Symmetry: D3
Subunit: 266 residues, 6 copies
């Protein structure tokens, strides 16, 4: 079960309004790698774990924190949309506002009454296909490192897309939390790799066709990847290199379908 | 530019038909973490790189290889759909085929003429939201390790979802290529982390609020995550632990919108 | 069956072109709460009814009217796109059109030849997930009141987003029809609630855990909702209030899955 | 900010596993009118309100409660998926499981390791297009009554889709909470209608073309809707009736576009 | 404007129920190439035309007819869902219904109350990305031929997916109407090609690099396409053939981005 | 299997940067009728063909060529995005850039680091619903002609949306390839229509209700379509014309559902 306090985890108030920045911050709210993705991924993984409490609890702790970040980004967008221009009265007050209006999300005013959406900057709805919860935490802790990496890259970019020190104060807090999250998820990843194996899943080495498992195959005519040849991979075995990969599988010849399908193919 | 040969990279022919397995393999063709996601992600990242040839060429090599895997999965699905039941004549021939029909994708017959789709097992279209190309290869090589990890987990599951030795032969090849891809992307990741930093992006340490960068925050009442307290994180600094995270940001109070919005909120 | 006349239900011609307003009006054509949603919802519900003709016919009457509104919005958008700028020759004519171009939907010209799309202002395709037809008209008449409420709110906003008297004339007609539709659907709602009950569905009172049916639970630390305590609800029973909701269900513990799933969770 | 406890709001454990029922309950987790829709809609509306605390707090209270229901449905699905069949070893063990496998979501095993998804029963991803937050609480409290109405209808149907008394115990609780939520949102609706008006938005009566605001228009040739003629609408005015609605707007004639568009239309 | 009659264009009643066939027919209602796609495409194109009345009227005539077909398919699905099994009480009166339940769309009962959806057989929502209206009727009449071709192929397949003579009677009518629609759209296509040219658009021959306009390029190593060499194309010019197409464009080298983007690429 | 060369099929470098043109070109990369649609459609159809090598090889040759075009469009977008404005420091340098920034896709910088996406100009993700592969090549060759027609229309429009002669040189090449592809697919279409029939599928004439197969039905009150009356259709039979189409199928009445569904409809 959850409980809520009205106080934000950390400040989320800009020094001044900016509806263009509000639109950019929709990426962190409703985007592919944003806070809603983190919230739903970590809570899903946490609820689905039957394993060690160390990781189950880490996931539920962090998913719950991400809900605080969803709240912060939402709040920041709302403050940034204060007094935003949306019609002829605004243009009569200051005709230069036409440029601002051109760059805004039309739906911020029309659909939401100058409030945040749960979409990205381009109005694409957040959706569950952005979420990963596979049942395997070696894989999913790697996913979580990536989620925080892609997110922290975006927050870093956002920092250079505003000069508002109130906006930047919030971003500086989020950058630091994303450092913590990257590090905690890397530690879990490394512990799980030691337990189960460096390759996911770790119990398939006998089954796989091992002769192809350490061969770098040169399918594009640049030769840059040849630098991996002879380097030692993380499992202790060296990469070999094939300059001219071979097509070993034959020519497909599937049986034509039943006439009731009307597969007229010449 | 690309060129094509009709020969497959490796065998993709089952010993017998199985339209239920064909539906499962749609995950590997049109699903979230499948071969189309790999193909499009690696090609995109490769095209978008202005950096080291070692990595640009690796990405183009591997993206091109994934096109061969898309071709293999497509081919295997087509063979597995041979003679699949789709109407009353088939049920008259063998009434037990009703169970098979109930588990099939209705669109395999109706839309595609007993051929593969570019959807997942549930008919959800493959879409570009599954693809990541960010401009930062520290982040994206981590993504690529995840893509191969989630994929190889699924391929491993598929191995236990059939007893067909022809299907399994293909899967054994793919498992091995996914081991190679996991390892080559991990090596690139490790080199890029040494160059740029273990936190992504590596050039924001002074900007972030460092006091919060190594604190584990206990938001869920389980205590499993306390086991991280005092462990040395990958950047050389120990994690600290906060039993009772504090709401530091105040209660938001956003300004009411202009009357032309009709924001009647009480 | 349907028949069509080329004459519009009501005027849908603007005094002047304005491709920014055209983009806004895509909300009314292809958006979440727009006229296509109304058309498809009311027709679907009407076709699905096996009940009283008073309501079945109301739904078919109104769904058919909404088709006329779809036609009007489409027509208005096409007029509004007349002479819209789309390339260098327009900027040679009037360099000040750059601002207009920046705010336009790029697809209006490129994809549609300066004609309406079936997308919202952000290019998101209209989709059937916007439509409700459940089989229960107590629920669905409430939905229809909502549909007309959200739509009329948007139409009201649009009125303040232009000074064009021809656009406003059309909007004044739609506002009036939306008043009628809100009222007719509220009357149906109330008649259906008298027949079946104020709670949907009205035949589950013995089954539900009545102990929890009138309790306001305080999950967020604001105390504003305590004002509802002791007020009489629409069914004649007073609300009680719980300042500290209890977690009554225990800590879940699901069985670890079969090893064929490779659920490595620590 | 939020905090989490591992204890569930109410019991969410079935007496027996049933992966077909797990698939149905995906509607309540990831579907159009499910608990994620409630959670995100009420939180969004609550965060976006600058108005009376009575309603802002009610929304945040209830949105936070819905997160507990998301957790319960997720948990129930996980328990229901225990020991679910997914490959040849299960059919070797008990060939009668083929019917169960045919009805399952293939991704429950393959993607999630016999855990819940954030999709509906058909694998369609939950998405933000299911959420409404408009800025007007007269409209949105009506939406919330609908959300709880469509949901409680689905929960009622689910009750008749299982004989498991453990599942039914959870459903009986949810039915009761949905009664409370319907009633509280109706009370807010009633207060807001008394304040602002029965038509949403309530400040446009002078602007609309009033001559069309109370006319029932007969567009479908059934006569059932004539029963509304002469009835008093909720705003105190009687409905009139038009047996033959007229097309008042003329035949549109839009200007042909610039030749650079290549609009070759004959 | 539109008007509606309760009488269907043609019979749409099955001899007996069949919820599996109901699910198949969702392709014709909510699928990619189904009746909703035809309705919305032809109406959109018709509204958007400023050209010859012969074609504008044909489009509006046919789009309006397709609305009747939407109505018929919806009706047929509702009849086919009569008495469909959905819970434990159905299996008790007849246990052989288990296979039927396994093959049904779970949402037909749960969401819609045993009524049609606006989704395809897999639950994927109909969406406007299935619709084409480009402004060029040489292109769009070709699209319309295709829409009727793909649809009639599906109807033909459906004919072999049931033995119900009432279902078949409806399909025999639709097959005939799709013959008419293919033929009328082909006639329009041919007239428009005579007026504007066989290549769309017909006014770019001077602009294009003509040396590449009639060359078959052999990118896949099969030699089957060599059979086109020397054949006369529809514009009166012979195809030539290139066995080894050449990469003529150089190796791209794009400029690295500004450091504020953090594009760390090695 | 595939192989890649770093050299482009044809030049794809602009004379100057232009991030607005970059956004337009996203239509050709990630849009409905763009190069990814062609690539995936032709490869899918080619892999799925069991018929004549002339057409199977044509499809694989062309699908492979379209991969080169995807690469070209990607490259062109990346060059066009060089030095694009994205933050306050750019506006300090030149305040005039505000108009450019307003028209840009915010995700080009924020998500991709000033690189191409796999979305259309509005940020809508490319998806597999844009792809057709049906099993019948009479239908699908028609689709392919359409694909190349809609695409060449868009490329022709793009030609009038820039004055950059480097962009135009690329477009001139693509126009010529689209002429070739339109012609080769029309030739295949013609040959297949001679073999199987002018109506798709060509083996249903006895089954369909022939009396309705050549009747133009006047559902919209314009009279333009009467011009088809008496013209000879492509199968050699004349069209007839029905001024007042009749509703022949009666008024349906579906049985009310079981009470367990709670279908309260009045
Ligand atoms: Ca290489
Ligand atoms: Ca904890
Ligand atoms: Ca409270
Ligand atoms: Ca009527
Ligand atoms: Ca060839
Ligand atoms: Ca006509
Ligand atoms: Mn965060
Ligand atoms: Mn985080
Ligand atoms: Mn692969
Ligand atoms: Mn791989
Ligand atoms: Mn309307
Ligand atoms: Mn209305
Ligand atoms: Mn609930
Ligand atoms: Mn509720
Ligand atoms: Mn039709
Ligand atoms: Mn038709
Ligand atoms: Mn091309
Ligand atoms: Mn082409
Ligand atoms: O975070
Ligand atoms: O985060
Ligand atoms: O791979
Ligand atoms: O892969
Ligand atoms: O309306
Ligand atoms: O409406
Ligand atoms: O609830
Ligand atoms: O709920
Ligand atoms: O049709
Ligand atoms: O049709
Ligand atoms: O092309
Ligand atoms: O193309």
């Amino acid at each position: 079960m959850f409980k809520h306090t009205r106080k934000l985890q950390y400040n989320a108030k800009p020094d001044r309004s900016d509806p263009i920045m509000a639109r950019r911050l929709q990426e962190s709210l409703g985007g592919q790698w944003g806070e809603t993705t983190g919230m739903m991924s970590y809570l899903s993984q946490g609820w689905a774990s039957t394993g060690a409490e160390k990781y189950k609890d880490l996931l539920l702790d962090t998913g719950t924190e991400e809900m605080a970040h969803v709240e912060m980004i939402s709040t920041m967008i709302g403050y940034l949309l204060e007094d935003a221009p949306f019609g002829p009265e605004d243009l009569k007050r200051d005709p230069s506002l036409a440029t601002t209006m051109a760059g805004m999300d039309p739906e911020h005013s029309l659909v939401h009454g100058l409030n945040a959406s749960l979409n990205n900057p381009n109005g694409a709805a957040w959706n569950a296909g952005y979420v990963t919860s596979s049942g395997n935490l070696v894989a999913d802790m790697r996913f979580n490192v990536v989620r925080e990496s892609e997110a922290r890259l975006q927050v870093s970019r956002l920092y250079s897309m505003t000069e508002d020190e109130g906006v930047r104060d919030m971003l500086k807090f989020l950058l630091a939390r994303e450092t913590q999250h990257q590090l905690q998820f890397m530690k879990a990843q490394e512990e799980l790799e030691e337990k189960y194996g460096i390759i996911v899943p770790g119990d398939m080495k006998e089954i796989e066709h091992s002769e192809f498992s350490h061969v770098l195959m040169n399918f594009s005519d640049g030769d840059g990847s040849k630098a991996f040849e002879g380097q030692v991979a993380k499992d202790g075995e060296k990469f070999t290199y094939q300059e001219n990969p071979e097509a070993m599988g034959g020519i497909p010849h599937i049986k034509p379908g039943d006439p009731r399908l009307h597969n007229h193919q010449g």
